[PDB]
């Protein structure tokens, strides 16, 4: 099939901003993260392109709660209330309850509820880039590797975990399991996946 493109809109909340210090430090870090996300998805004939960026240097336009569900719902609610993107990814400096660092609306890509929330949990920008690729994967119809029986992951190194494992562990994931790929292909059957057909400029 032809290359698919995610036109991505990133929002950085107040906590994240005050954590990085300045506007340039955030732009630098966002470009880092998005560059790696795009790198991970190139192995799926996917391009992830940043088309918009919003930094809340003063206050958040909605409540970012320690609970990912709340924050995610607040994002989708706030977003709906314009642009032209396919997907919205929130990056926060708020530490989510427990060990949770990401949450997403499943199979919502291209819909009005197309979004996810990501905590910048690691000094390495790769940390939040893998989380977002994972979350973005949910938006694209992917489940956890452990929820698909006989799912095969071709990661030869570390613990052999892939991007869509329900837990990161001690090493950041690098590839997509075979079930990830299969589920993404199924999602690309849905007529709603049409918004991924347009290559930006
Ligand atoms: C470093 N932290 C982790 O590895 C935790 C570990 C964990 C696993 C299960 C339950 C709670 C915590 N995993 C996540 O943060 C997942 C995202 C990662 C894999 C990118 C995240 C867990 S989902 C929920 C957790 C609690 C309520 S809902 C997920 O699946 N989003 O897509
Ligand atoms: Ca599009
Ligand atoms: Cl989720
Ligand atoms: K890596
Ligand atoms: K999967
Ligand atoms: Na936490
Ligand atoms: Na891992
Ligand atoms: Zn998940």
From Swiss-Prot:
Gene Ontology molecular function: any one: cell adhesion molecule binding
Active site: 135
Subcellular location: Membrane
Keyword hit for Aminoacyl-tRNA synthetase: no
Binding-site positions, Zn(2+): 134, 138, 144
Subunit text: Interacts with FST3.
Protein name per the record: Disintegrin and metalloproteinase domain-containing protein 8
Species for this entry: Homo sapiens (Human)
Residue window of the full protein shown: 197 to 401 of 824
């Amino acid at each position: 099939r032809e290359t698919r493109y995610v036109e991505l809109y990133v929002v950085v909340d107040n906590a994240e901003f005050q954590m990085l210090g300045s506007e340039a430090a955030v732009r630098h870090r966002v470009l880092e993260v998005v560059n790696h996300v795009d790198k991970l998805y190139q192995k799926l004939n996917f391009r992830v392109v940043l088309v918009g960026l919003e930094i809340w240097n003063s206050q958040d336009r909605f409540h970012v709660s320690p609970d990912p569900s709340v924050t995610l719902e607040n994002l989708l609610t706030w977003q709906a209330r314009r642009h032209l993107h396919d997907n919205v990814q929130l990056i926060t400096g708020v530490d989510f309850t427990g060990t949770t660092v990401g949450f997403a609306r499943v199979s919502a890509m291209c819909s009005h509820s197309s979004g996810a929330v990501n905590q910048d949990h690691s000094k390495n920008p790769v940390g939040v880039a893998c989380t977002m690729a994972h979350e973005m994967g949910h938006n694209l119809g992917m489940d956890h590797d452990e929820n698909v029986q006989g799912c095969r992951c071709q990661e030869r190194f570390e613990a052999g975990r892939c991007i869509m494992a329900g837990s990161i562990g001690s090493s950041f994931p690098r590839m997509f399991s075979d079930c990830s790929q299969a589920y993404l292909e199924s999602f690309l059957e849905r007529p709603q996946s049409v918004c991924l057909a347009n290559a930006p400029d």
